[PDB]
Design a protein around this nucleic acid. Structure first.
Ligand SMILES: [K+]
Ligand SMILES: [K+]
Ligand SMILES: [K+]
Ligand SMILES: [K+]
Ligand SMILES: [K+]
Ligand SMILES: [K+]
Ligand SMILES: [K+]
Ligand SMILES: [K+]
Ligand SMILES: [K+]
Ligand SMILES: [Mg+2]
Ligand SMILES: [Mg+2]
Ligand SMILES: [Mg+2]
Ligand SMILES: [Mg+2]
Ligand SMILES: [Mg+2]
Ligand SMILES: [Mg+2]
Ligand SMILES: [Mg+2]
Ligand SMILES: [Mg+2]
Ligand SMILES: [Mg+2]
Ligand SMILES: [Mg+2]
Ligand SMILES: [Mg+2]
Ligand SMILES: [Mg+2]
Ligand SMILES: [Mg+2]
Ligand SMILES: [Mg+2]
Ligand SMILES: [Mg+2]
Ligand SMILES: [Mg+2]
Ligand SMILES: [Mg+2]
Ligand SMILES: [Mg+2]
Ligand SMILES: [Mg+2]
Ligand SMILES: [Mg+2]
Lengths: 52, 56, 187, 147, 53, 125, 128
RNA sequence: UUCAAGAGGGCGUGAAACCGUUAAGAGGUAAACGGGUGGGGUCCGCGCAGUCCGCCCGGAGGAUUCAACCCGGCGGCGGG
RNA sequence: GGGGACCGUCCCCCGACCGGCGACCGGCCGCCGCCGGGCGCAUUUCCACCGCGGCGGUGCGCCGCGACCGGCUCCGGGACG
RNA sequence: CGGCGACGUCGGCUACCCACCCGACCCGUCUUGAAACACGGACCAAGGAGUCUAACACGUGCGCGAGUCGGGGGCUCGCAC
RNA sequence: CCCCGCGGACGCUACGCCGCGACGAGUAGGAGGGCCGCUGCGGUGAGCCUUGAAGCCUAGGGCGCGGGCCCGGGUGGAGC
């Protein structure tokens, strides 16, 4: 049971993975390459009103 | 001495060795002497610019 | 059969970065083209430094960069380091510097910019000086590492001043026999 | 990842890299630091001089806190205050010198490695080295002791 | 997460990571007149082995 | 940037097919359908694609406009050409060459248009 | 009749026979799959004359004709019609074939579509 | 009966070793193996009068409309 | 203890000059291209068929033959010094 | 440039059986030396042996950098994940 | 100052493609590559499948130097 299942990742690492993930989510080629069918989406940094 | 056979080549032997089997060490590569420009590029500074100069 | 030895045929050298950093790979592409299509030996040195490991790209402190920039005849020249530029809190006056680096520490970056300096990346350096003209190629201390204190002759040999590997430092840890004449020998 | 290791490449090779003649056996040469003065003497003498024997005086019930005395050098001295402090003092017309309390910053002794900028300063510390005191007075400063 | 000229106001110590390559447009950089002026002419003729007659 | 986006999807993409010592890419606007920086139909500011018409006759020439690169809904302009093969190839040639709109894809688009039209004519007995 | 490849070079095979494992003829427990002999006294490993030959890189096929079918095409496995259109511009160099698990109804559509796109199918009549 | 007993109460699938029978071939240097051919056999090749397609020429037929102009729409590039 | 002043970073604005409209976008123009609809209704254009037609490319269902050119090689004649 | 092509033939060096010529001792293992009168192995199936923890050392990759690191704790609807 | 022709092959997964030269024995051992193979997890294939999954059998067709893999036929019956 003491196989060391967990890993610690530096906080600056982890914040920098989030920034890369967010920046990639605004580029159509990368989101399409994940196969998300963003063919008719008006704008990929896609923002809706607070009413939702 | 036991590993080699050697002697004194004559003019014809030098000609046929250079013309039939003459290869130049150009940029560390074994390049066949098909053109005079290959000889002149690497040996022109010494006055040797053709196969005849190399044979001489 | 031919009489040669094949143990040195394969030269051991970096032909590419072992990193998967796509930004580093992009500017390796840029400087692979510049080294090939120019006669500038500066591009050749920069390209091969881009392949190098982190231990072979030691950080360059701000003090060391300033000191090399202050040498005569290096005014209005770009300081180029293939690695990280580091703030040195031991200096109090930062002059105006034109700098190209792979990476600059936030505090060092603020100090350079506040002093009227300019910071370039290697893509901008290619546009500024494609052949590297008017540049000073600097390097951090390559042997400024703790490992090099342990390298060399063995500690238990005469006239060797190499640091031994000890879990602790104290009077009880490897200071007796073989270290003083009273305890057998010293060498 | 076990898929990246030599074991995956040593399948089909009978000795698993340990060799046919010498084999891989339990503990040839002893266990741990066995035979450090006998059959492993050369390694211990070559790489760990001083390992064997006693040197010095022992001290029962050592309390590391009593000997607590962190040190700071003069080259790092001005980093203990704000950048506002040092520019204000430099451009100050009077002879007013700022006070640097190294005990507040967590240091007890002021060592004298490096050089100081040419401006006076009052340095408060528990201990001063001889050369640190000399350099502080050279720039027109003063050293005052605290307990 | 902040800007490159503002630190993050909800992380107390974080700032956006910096680019090691500002302009990642390789085609535009290589076609720039500054780069093209410094280059030597391309060697595009292929020299295949000559059969030694 | 095209080069930066290429370094991300050159080996990691949902359109990537790697089988039988071959590699293919199935993104919508990939002429020749090959995994390459030149022919990738997603990473470039301007791209051209040739597709069969919605019905069984003609071709659809889709180009990428320059304005809304982050707005995929209006980023592609689709035109339908339903004339004879020689006239259809001339229109595609003029769209690419006269506009200087990616001239490196001229023959790829023309060859693909020929393949589509050749597939639309009825089979023989 | 059949769709012809763009070019049909003469395919030269250095070896036409399989490399069988040493002593796979003497035991059922040992399969014909090749395994490098590593015994200290093995005469096959030592390359004695008249023994079982060992595969090596010298037997490699010409890169121009590698993976080429006898028909001059190279094969791409397909599972549906959508994967078939990747070969539209590779018609004269690559041939499609349908995966074994594809149903009889679905591979009928693949064969029909491939006939239209002039793609050659190695197994066009495979469930019928 | 069952869709199926080529699922029949230790019954899903049902390998190898080993055995029976049928078919083919062979047989005094134990078998087995590597290389090279030859013979026979089972199959494969829509094999069986053997490619396709670009331009041009000639013959015999159809279809609009070919170019250029007009209107509209949409794009690319340039603009102190 | 507050509250102030100052300093460093900011902020949205009131405004001008500076480099450019950029890979941040619109409107106007100019050129070009495509599409749709008219007109153009035939020495134009396009479609399919035929010729045992020509020019190119690829390649011949199978089994064969010849020719010249070049590379390597082993030999044989003739003549000259 | 020639010959030949459907119920008899054409091509398939792979794959099945057979024949002949040449070559060919049974593997594994210890060993200076194994075909050994050296040991293990009748045959087939399934199982079957450098792993995990800790500690070092060096190399490489990543982040930050004279700093670095929250791993213990605490705060976030208390919990599909 | 291209224009009776408005036209002109391929390429460059830059971790790609191309050229030239030399070289190739190997136990113990070291290293690299593996679109070799097994099982499970996160993504992805608008993947496959009762119009037949896995598995198994096969004088069937092939691919790879090889590890192995794909396809045809049969059996099988729910997954891959
Ligand atoms: K070396
Ligand atoms: K080992
Ligand atoms: K070998
Ligand atoms: K059953
Ligand atoms: K035995
Ligand atoms: K914690
Ligand atoms: K999956
Ligand atoms: K293989
Ligand atoms: K099956
Ligand atoms: Mg050799
Ligand atoms: Mg060797
Ligand atoms: Mg070995
Ligand atoms: Mg074994
Ligand atoms: Mg052993
Ligand atoms: Mg084979
Ligand atoms: Mg066997
Ligand atoms: Mg041996
Ligand atoms: Mg059944
Ligand atoms: Mg049963
Ligand atoms: Mg039987
Ligand atoms: Mg033994
Ligand atoms: Mg003995
Ligand atoms: Mg033996
Ligand atoms: Mg004996
Ligand atoms: Mg024994
Ligand atoms: Mg047994
Ligand atoms: Mg026994
Ligand atoms: Mg097993
Ligand atoms: Mg070798």
């Amino acid at each position: 049971t003491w196989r060391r299942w967990h890993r610690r990742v530096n906080t600056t690492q982890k914040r920098y993975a989030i920034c890369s993930a967010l920046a990639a989510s605004a580029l159509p080629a990368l989101v399409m390459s994940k196969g998300h069918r963003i063919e008719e989406v008006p704008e990929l940094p896609l923002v809706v009103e607070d009413k939702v | 001495e036991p590993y080699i056979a050697w002697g004194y080549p004559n003019l014809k032997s030098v000609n046929e060795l250079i013309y039939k089997r003459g290869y130049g060490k150009i940029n560390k590569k074994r390049i066949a002497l098909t053109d005079n420009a290959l000889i002149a590029r690497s040996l022109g500074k010494y006055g040797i610019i053709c196969m005849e100069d190399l044979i001489h | 059969g031919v009489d040669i030895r094949h143990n040195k045929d394969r030269k051991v050298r970096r032909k590419e970065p072992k990193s998967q950093d796509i930004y580093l790979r992009l500017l390796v592409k840029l400087y692979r083209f510049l080294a090939r299509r120019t006669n500038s030996t500066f591009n050749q040195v920069v390209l091969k430094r881009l392949f190098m490991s982190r231990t072979n790209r030691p950080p360059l402190s701000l003090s060391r960069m300033i000191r090399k920039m202050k040498l005569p005849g290096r005014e209005n020249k770009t300081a180029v380091v293939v690695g990280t530029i580091t703030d040195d809190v031991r200096v109090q006056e930062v002059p105006k510097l034109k700098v190209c680096a792979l990476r600059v520490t936030s505090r060092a970056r603020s100090r350079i910019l506040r002093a009227g300096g300019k910071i370039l990346t290697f893509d901008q350096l290619a546009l500024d000086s494609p052949k590297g003209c008017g540049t000073v190629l600097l390097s951090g201390p390559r042997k400024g590492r703790e490992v090099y204190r342990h390298f060399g002759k063995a500690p238990g040999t005469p006239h060797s001043h190499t640091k031994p590997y000890v879990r602790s430092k104290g009077r009880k840890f490897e200071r007796a026999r073989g270290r003083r004449a009273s305890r057998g020998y010293k060498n | 990842p076990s898929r990246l290791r030599k074991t995956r490449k040593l399948r089909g090779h009978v000795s698993h890299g340990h060799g046919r003649i010498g084999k891989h056996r339990k503990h040839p040469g002893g266990r741990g630091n066995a035979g450090g003065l006998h059959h492993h003497r050369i390694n211990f003498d070559k790489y760990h001089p001083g390992y064997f024997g006693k040197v010095g005086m022992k001290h029962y019930h050592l309390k590391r806190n009593q000997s607590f005395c962190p040190t700071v050098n003069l080259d790092k001295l001005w980093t203990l205050v704000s950048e506002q402090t040092r520019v204000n003092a430099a451009k100050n017309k009077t002879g007013a010198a700022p006070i640097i309390d190294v005990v507040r910053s967590g240091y007890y002794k002021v060592l004298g490695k490096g050089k100081l900028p040419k401006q006076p300063v009052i340095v408060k510390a528990k201990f001063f080295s001889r050369r640190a005191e000399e350099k502080i007075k050279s720039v027109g400063g003063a050293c005052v002791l605290v307990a | 997460y902040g800007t490159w000229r503002k630190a993050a106001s909800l992380k107390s110590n974080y700032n956006l990571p910096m680019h090691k390559m500002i302009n990642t447009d390789l085609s535009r950089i290589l076609k720039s007149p500054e780069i093209q002026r410094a280059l030597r002419a391309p060697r595009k003729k292929i020299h295949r082995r000559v059969l030694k007659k | 940037s095209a080069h930066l986006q290429w370094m991300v999807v050159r080996n990691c993409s949902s359109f990537l097919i790697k089988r039988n010592k071959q590699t293919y890419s199935t993104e919508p606007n990939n002429l020749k359908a090959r995994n390459s920086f030149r022919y990738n139909g997603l990473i470039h500011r301007k791209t051209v694609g040739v597709e069969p018409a919605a019905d069984g006759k003609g071709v659809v020439v889709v180009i990428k406009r320059r304005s809304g690169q982050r707005k995929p809904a209006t980023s592609y302009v689709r035109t339908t050409i339903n004339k004879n093969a020689r006239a259809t190839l001339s229109s595609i040639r003029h769209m690419i060459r006269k506009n200087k709109y990616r001239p490196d894809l001229r023959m790829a688009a023309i060859r693909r248009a020929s393949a589509i039209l050749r597939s639309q004519k009825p089979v023989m007995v | 009749a059949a769709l012809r490849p763009l070019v049909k070079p003469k395919i030269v095979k250095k070896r036409t026979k399989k490399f069988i494992r040493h002593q796979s003829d003497r035991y059922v427990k040992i399969k014909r799959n090749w395994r490098k002999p590593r015994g200290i006294d093995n005469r096959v490993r030592r390359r004695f004359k008249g023994q079982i030959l060992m595969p090596n890189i010298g037997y490699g096929s010409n890169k121009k004709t590698k993976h080429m079918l006898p028909s001059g095409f190279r094969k791409f496995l397909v599972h549906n019609v959508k994967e078939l259109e990747v070969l539209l511009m590779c018609n004269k160099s690559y041939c499609a074939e349908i995966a074994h698990n594809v149903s009889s109804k679905n591979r009928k559509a693949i064969v029909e579509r491939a006939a239209q796109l002039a793609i050659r199918v190695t197994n066009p009549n495979a469930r019928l």
